[PDB]
Design a protein around this ligand. Structure first.
Ligand SMILES: F[C@H]1CCN(c2nccc(-c3cnn4ncccc34)n2)C1
Length: 340
């Protein structure tokens, strides 16, 4: 059985060969990552004399076209951030090679899920969480600039990479599922644990969905475990409500999917359709604000005082506002006293 004249496997992926030279320019070293899109290889760019990561997209039209969207968005961001100060991965160039679209990037390191695994799923310190939060809010501020207006739409620990294994600098990756505020097409979006209530409820959405995801990500980075680990949409919404309570009636009254999860009482108030009772799984206790941090494991550690935790909790709750019009926006998140 032959795929792509012998160059591809049965998963639409290019069969990586060590030492292969491409286009009289790149010497392929090794496979360093993989995902639904294809593969990431370490390669030496002999023209620029540097190591690069090449994202080799699957040779299949749906994957190609997803990547073409990604290339356009990365090129737009490139021409609007030439100093590379806004925490988005830098696309150096792209090319088609043996029926695969290939995106050449700066080399990065481990993703933040890998980092959580490296903590044995116990979380990173509040101080490292703060550094990640500040960089992510800066990235979201850039995506919100009017000429971009990019909604990432799939923020999760796996899509945030360290630049260097020993440093806290990060870059956001993976814009294949992204869109712009003026051209919102998708109804079904965001990975489930990180999915905003407006998307669960079938309501209009905007860049605020990414702030919701960030709030979820930051809690998980410090505790080691997802904040809302739903097995399906109904379970996801129920897990959200355990922490945050029943959403406001003015939202549910306008939500096409309200009755997937909730029922309206003769009061006019809404309740869940037949979990811990609503709002009784307190973020205050998830974070261990007064009890030594998650699992009590930060008791007697510098940089984890009650005051520090109260600042973090306050910021997170503003990121997890059910109302996307009042959910904290990146400019103001960066001014919050968690960062002072
Ligand atoms: F192989 C792993 C170690 C280095 N990596 C790396 N390095 C630079 C860029 C990227 C990257 C760019 N876009 N995406 N999208 C999705 C996934 C990764 C990427 N990954 C991943």
């Amino acid at each position: 059985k032959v795929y792509n004249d012998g160059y591809d496997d049965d998963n639409y992926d290019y069969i990586v060969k060590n030492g292969e030279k491409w286009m009289d320019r790149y010497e392929i070293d090794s496979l360093i990552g993989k995902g639904s899109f294809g593969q990431v290889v370490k390669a030496y760019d002999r023209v620029e004399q540097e190591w690069v990561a090449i994202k080799i997209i699957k040779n299949k039209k749906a994957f190609l076209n997803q990547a073409q969207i990604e290339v356009r968005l990365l090129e737009l961001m490139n021409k609007h951030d030439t100093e590379m100060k806004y925490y988005i991965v830098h696309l150096k160039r792209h090319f088609m090679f043996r029926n695969h679209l290939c995106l050449v990037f700066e080399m990065l390191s481990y993703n933040l899920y890998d980092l959580l695994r490296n903590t044995n799923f116990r979380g990173v310190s509040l101080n490292l969480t703060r550094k990640f939060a500040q960089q992510m809010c800066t990235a979201l501020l850039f995506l919100a600039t009017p000429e971009l207006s990019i909604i990432h739409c799939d923020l999760k620990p796996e899509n945030i990479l360290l630049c260097n294994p020993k440093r806290s600098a990060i870059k956001i990756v993976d814009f294949g599922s992204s869109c712009q505020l003026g051209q919102r097409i998708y109804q079904y979006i965001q990975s489930r644990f990180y999915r905003s209530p407006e998307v669960l409820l079938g309501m209009p959405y905007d860049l605020a969905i990414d702030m919701w995801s960030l709030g979820c990500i930051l809690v998980e980075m410090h505790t080691g475990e997802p904040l809302f680990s739903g097995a399906n949409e109904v379970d996801q919404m129920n897990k959200i409500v355990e922490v945050l309570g029943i959403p406001p009636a003015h939202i549910l009254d306008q939500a096409p999917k309200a009755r997937k999860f909730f029922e309206k009482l003769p009061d006019g108030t809404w309740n869940l359709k037949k979990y811990k009772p609503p709002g009784t799984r307190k973020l205050h206790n998830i974070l261990g604000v007064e009890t030594g941090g998650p699992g009590g494991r930060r008791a007697g550690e510098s940089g984890h005082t009650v005051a520090d935790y109260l600042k973090f909790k306050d910021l997170i709750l503003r990121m997890l506002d059910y109302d996307p019009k009042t959910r904290i926006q990146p400019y103001y998140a960066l001014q919050h006293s968690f960062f002072k």
